[PDB]
Amino acid sequence: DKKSARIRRATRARRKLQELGATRLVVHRTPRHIYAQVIAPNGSEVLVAASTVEKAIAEQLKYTGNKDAAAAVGKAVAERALEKGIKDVSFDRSGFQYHGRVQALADAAREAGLQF
Amino acid sequence: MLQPKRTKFRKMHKGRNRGLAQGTDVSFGSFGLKAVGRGRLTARQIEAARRAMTRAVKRQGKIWIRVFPDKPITEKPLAVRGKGKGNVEYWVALIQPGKVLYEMDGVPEELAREAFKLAAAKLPIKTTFVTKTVM
Amino acid sequence: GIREKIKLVSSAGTGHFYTTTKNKRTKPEKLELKKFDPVVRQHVIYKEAKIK
Amino acid sequence: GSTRNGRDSEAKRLGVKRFGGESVLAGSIIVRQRGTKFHAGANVGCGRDHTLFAKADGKVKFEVKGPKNRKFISIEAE
Amino acid sequence: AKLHDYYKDEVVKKLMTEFNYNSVMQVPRVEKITLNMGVGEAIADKKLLDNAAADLAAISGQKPLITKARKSVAGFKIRQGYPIGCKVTLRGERMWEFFERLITIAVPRIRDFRGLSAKSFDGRGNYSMGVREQIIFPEIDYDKVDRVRGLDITITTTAKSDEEGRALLAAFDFPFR
RNA sequence: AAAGUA
RNA sequence: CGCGGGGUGGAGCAGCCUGGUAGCUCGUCGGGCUUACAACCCGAAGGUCGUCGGUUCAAAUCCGGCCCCCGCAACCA
RNA sequence: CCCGACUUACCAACCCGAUGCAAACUGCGAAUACCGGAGAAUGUUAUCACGGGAGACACACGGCGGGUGCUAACGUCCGU
RNA sequence: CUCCUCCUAAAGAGUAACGGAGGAGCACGAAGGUUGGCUAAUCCUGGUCGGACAUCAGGAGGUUAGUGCAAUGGCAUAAGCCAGCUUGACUGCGAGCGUGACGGCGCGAGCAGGUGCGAAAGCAGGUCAUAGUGAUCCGGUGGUUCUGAAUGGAAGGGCCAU
RNA sequence: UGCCUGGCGGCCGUAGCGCGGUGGUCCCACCUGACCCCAUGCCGAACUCAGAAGUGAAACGCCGUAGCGCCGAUGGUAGUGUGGGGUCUCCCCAUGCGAGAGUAGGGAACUGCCAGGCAU
Numbered sequence A: 001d002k003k004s005a006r007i008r009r010a011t012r013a014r015r016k017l018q019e020l021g022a023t024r025l026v027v028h029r030t031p032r033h034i035y036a037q038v039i040a041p042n043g044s045e046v047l048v049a050a051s052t053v054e055k056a057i058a059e060q061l062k063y064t065g066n067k068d069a070a071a072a073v074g075k076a077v078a079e080r081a082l083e084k085g086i087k088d089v090s091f092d093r094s095g096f097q098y099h100g101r102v103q104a105l106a107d108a109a110r111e112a113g114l115q116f
Numbered sequence B: 001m002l003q004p005k006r007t008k009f010r011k012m013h014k015g016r017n018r019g020l021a022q023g024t025d026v027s028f029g030s031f032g033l034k035a036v037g038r039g040r041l042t043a044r045q046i047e048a049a050r051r052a053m054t055r056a057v058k059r060q061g062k063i064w065i066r067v068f069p070d071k072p073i074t075e076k077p078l079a080v081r082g083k084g085k086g087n088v089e090y091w092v093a094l095i096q097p098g099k100v101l102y103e104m105d106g107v108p109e110e111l112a113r114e115a116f117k118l119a120a121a122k123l124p125i126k127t128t129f130v131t132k133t134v135m
Numbered sequence C: 001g002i003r004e005k006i007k008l009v010s011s012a013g014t015g016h017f018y019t020t021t022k023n024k025r026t027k028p029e030k031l032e033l034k035k036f037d038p039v040v041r042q043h044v045i046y047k048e049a050k051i052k
Numbered sequence D: 001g002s003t004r005n006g007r008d009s010e011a012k013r014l015g016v017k018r019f020g021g022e023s024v025l026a027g028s029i030i031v032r033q034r035g036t037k038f039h040a041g042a043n044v045g046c047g048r049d050h051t052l053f054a055k056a057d058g059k060v061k062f063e064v065k066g067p068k069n070r071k072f073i074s075i076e077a078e
Numbered sequence E: 001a002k003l004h005d006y007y008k009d010e011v012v013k014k015l016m017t018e019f020n021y022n023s024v025m026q027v028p029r030v031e032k033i034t035l036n037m038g039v040g041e042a043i044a045d046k047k048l049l050d051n052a053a054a055d056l057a058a059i060s061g062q063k064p065l066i067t068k069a070r071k072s073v074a075g076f077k078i079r080q081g082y083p084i085g086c087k088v089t090l091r092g093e094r095m096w097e098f099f100e101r102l103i104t105i106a107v108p109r110i111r112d113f114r115g116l117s118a119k120s121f122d123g124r125g126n127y128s129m130g131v132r133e134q135i136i137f138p139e140i141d142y143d144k145v146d147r148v149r150g151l152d153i154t155i156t157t158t159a160k161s162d163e164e165g166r167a168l169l170a171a172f173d174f175p176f177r
Numbered sequence F: 001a002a003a004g005u006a
Numbered sequence G: 001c002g003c004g005g006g007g008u009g010g011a012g013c014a015g016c017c018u019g020g021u022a023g024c025u026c027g028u029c030g031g032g033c034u035u036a037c038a039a040c041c042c043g044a045a046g047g048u049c050g051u052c053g054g055u056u057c058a059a060a061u062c063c064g065g066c067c068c069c070c071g072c073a074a075c076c077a
Numbered sequence H: 001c002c003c004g005a006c007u008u009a010c011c012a013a014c015c016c017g018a019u020g021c022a023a024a025c026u027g028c029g030a031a032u033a034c035c036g037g038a039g040a041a042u043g044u045u046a047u048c049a050c051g052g053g054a055g056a057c058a059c060a061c062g063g064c065g066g067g068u069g070c071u072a073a074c075g076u077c078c079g080u
Numbered sequence I: 001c002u003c004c005u006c007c008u009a010a011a012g013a014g015u016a017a018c019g020g021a022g023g024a025g026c027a028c029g030a031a032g033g034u035u036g037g038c039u040a041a042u043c044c045u046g047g048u049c050g051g052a053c054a055u056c057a058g059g060a061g062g063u064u065a066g067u068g069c070a071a072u073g074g075c076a077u078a079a080g081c082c083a084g085c086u087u088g089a090c091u092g093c094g095a096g097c098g099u100g101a102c103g104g105c106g107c108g109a110g111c112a113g114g115u116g117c118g119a120a121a122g123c124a125g126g127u128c129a130u131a132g133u134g135a136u137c138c139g140g141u142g143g144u145u146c147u148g149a150a151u152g153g154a155a156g157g158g159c160c161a162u
Numbered sequence J: 001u002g003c004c005u006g007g008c009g010g011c012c013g014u015a016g017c018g019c020g021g022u023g024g025u026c027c028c029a030c031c032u033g034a035c036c037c038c039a040u041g042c043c044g045a046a047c048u049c050a051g052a053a054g055u056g057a058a059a060c061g062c063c064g065u066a067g068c069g070c071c072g073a074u075g076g077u078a079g080u081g082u083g084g085g086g087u088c089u090c091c092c093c094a095u096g097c098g099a100g101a102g103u104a105g106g107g108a109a110c111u112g113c114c115a116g117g118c119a120u
């Protein structure tokens, strides 16, 4: 199963981040959409979030499942995080390769101001 | 003469023999010979009693042996002083009170009683005749 | 105990050396590794030589 | 005759050195073990021989956590 | 491509009418075609494996993968990791082109050919057949062969049983006996 | 040079 | 009993050490020389290695028992 | 000839059901003992550290838990 | 006769016998570091040579595999399998702790300098761990801002590495 | 406010299997192409990218159902600390602690944060 394989792929880094007590920037990717959440060190409270299923973000995109959409989501999540005053997170690729849409989101968040 | 076909280890600690038995019900036949005492049953004894039983019933019915001699017993040869554990010489089953040792089926109760008495005369432990119970 | 002792000698000319072992029958090629030289306080190339 | 046995190795003094609720200083060994019968929790490290040791001052806490019902040792800050 | 279009344009409706499927996604599909050569003589001369791989590459239009022993076997004098075979996996356009070539050219050229067995199904709708001589493939020149070589062909199908697998294969006019 | 027996 | 060494074509003996089908001499069989036999010449066959277990992908081989044989030792009062 | 067709004095692996055994078995698991914290009473500080002086390092039997021996020894070797 | 693993050993440690069983006196510049990826045995069915067992495909199964070498404790976030880049198998130190009669032996965050892998958080002071060993003396080799029997040197000595 | 879905957790079988049914507006999944970023020790299978014609078939989620797994008393039994006793290899008495297995029975999880869709 693809989902179980990816969860297995992500577990080691997630356990390391929990042990380090870091604030996570977790990314989730589907063929149609991309999502980003900033999660508190306890792992059960979401501080900010942004995705292409939000109207305010999706209305400005030709397609919600490509690198341009990924960059828009990264920029939006970084701006909301900076508005909340977070500024310091660790990237959680969630078992996806650091590449393509995931990398474009991360680069947009870095450019917008998140430190990771 | 029963004895394990193979074992993990050749020799065993003496140990002890406390407690009451597990396996106190006639489970396979209709009649049983049950131990009332505590002790060891050698393979030779088990087989001497089996022979006595079987000849008494004229090889009719069915007989189960509920105990198996899985404990090896070592001895030191004569005129030896230490120097390592002795050699395995025979095999025993440890018996606690309540242990059903043999069961019989397919024969009348009187004949089973006679056969079991002849068998018990070969054994070093006191025994008693039991019958199957519904519960 | 077929493995033989060898030294790895700094290329920085300081005389500093590390020591280790090597299976000379299976790997005749000289061992070469970048290691920290505490005399010049830099990582440099170190090359195999006889143990003495 | 003679015996082919007669050998043994020295006892390794493994086991739990600090039990639940004990106050420890950072660095203290909590358990010595072969492999991870106990696992490292919060503020605990696992050394190269799988010794669990305190990474902060505090009180020893044992718990059972996770999907495998594994045993973890952590240090509660005091 | 021709056989893929034939599938999508006749076989889907044929199978839907035959088996009363409620969804087009339920129709059996040709997942992949795998060609294998068990070159057990390479342990004496590895160059034989090279020749077999060249033949497989010529037959399939694809670079083959050398397959090694999973474990040491005393009976065949092979140690674990010994290269003893070569395989090719065909999907998509390459699969369809090879399927068409095999159906329309190579199979009729089989020596004493009288139809393929319909019992060569593994129970889950996948088909396996054995080609005794590679010369049946026109991509192999009969004059330059140094040694006759066979192979195994497996057609892996998304069918759920042998009946659906054979129906799908026969919809392409597979030369069953 | 080496050739026993019936 | 203790310490060693062994057991492999019909006989005597190699190979074992150090894991990947094992050989020599005599003997046997078929042919040849002879009136015939012997001697001699040519050709061929014959053992999964004492018996079991274990290790090993694989054991004549390494390890552990069991049987048989040989050589030393089994003593002081 | 390739096949095959029956039958077992039969032996029966795997699996299913039922019955036991284990120092070097454990999908369970005590009593005690041990480590740590808190509290009262009691106890000639009974505790720890440093320093002056030693003796001792052949132990015995009895109870309990055991190895060995024959669940032999006023036997032998540990634990308490 | 030293070392390692199990049991005896009485659910903390330790615990004897000419008690019961097995191993070591190494191996590896990758079999070490790191990043990314992956998941076993066995059986059934179909398939050229190919057979009980080679490679191929599917299914069952779920670690019954694997671990450089004994045994125990571990291991899926794998410590098991594959590949890229590499030298942290770094140098100076070290809060604190374990274990020893002692000589000693072990675990260790963190600090300074310099380094590898990673986008990054980070990881790396050898290897899944526990055997693979030998005090002191006497000398050998290299280094050295130490010493240098009147003085300058030198010899010899010290210190550091071996 | 309710229903549905996705992500991250708590918890770690009363929560997992099996069997039956059911869902596509959205979401998810399969899916459509691949010259390209990237990739196959062969293969766009996987990874990756560009998309949205089709389908809920598979997967997933939800609902139902004890054939299993799982949980599980009360009582009794085993063992056992201390003191006493016997016919002392083994037991009994007073007191304190008290299983394991099995029985009755339970049982088709519960829950926090954020986001989206629909009704309202």
Ligand SMILES: [K+]
Pocket: E124, E125, E126, E157, E158, E159, E160
């Ligand atoms: K199929």
Ligand SMILES: [K+]
Pocket: none
């Ligand atoms: K005793």
Ligand SMILES: [K+]
Pocket: none
């Ligand atoms: K005593």
Ligand SMILES: [K+]
Pocket: I009
């Ligand atoms: K113990």
Ligand SMILES: [K+]
Pocket: none
């Ligand atoms: K490596």
Ligand SMILES: [K+]
Pocket: none
């Ligand atoms: K590597």
Ligand SMILES: [K+]
Pocket: none
């Ligand atoms: K010390």
Ligand SMILES: [K+]
Pocket: none
């Ligand atoms: K000097």
Ligand SMILES: [K+]
Pocket: I149
């Ligand atoms: K002078």
Ligand SMILES: [K+]
Pocket: none
């Ligand atoms: K000098």
Ligand SMILES: [K+]
Pocket: J108
């Ligand atoms: K359930």
Ligand SMILES: [Mg+2]
Pocket: B016
């Ligand atoms: Mg006992």
Ligand SMILES: [Mg+2]
Pocket: B019
């Ligand atoms: Mg018992």
Ligand SMILES: [Mg+2]
Pocket: D009, D010, D011, D012
């Ligand atoms: Mg030990």
Ligand SMILES: [Mg+2]
Pocket: F005
């Ligand atoms: Mg004569």
Ligand SMILES: [Mg+2]
Pocket: none
């Ligand atoms: Mg004399």
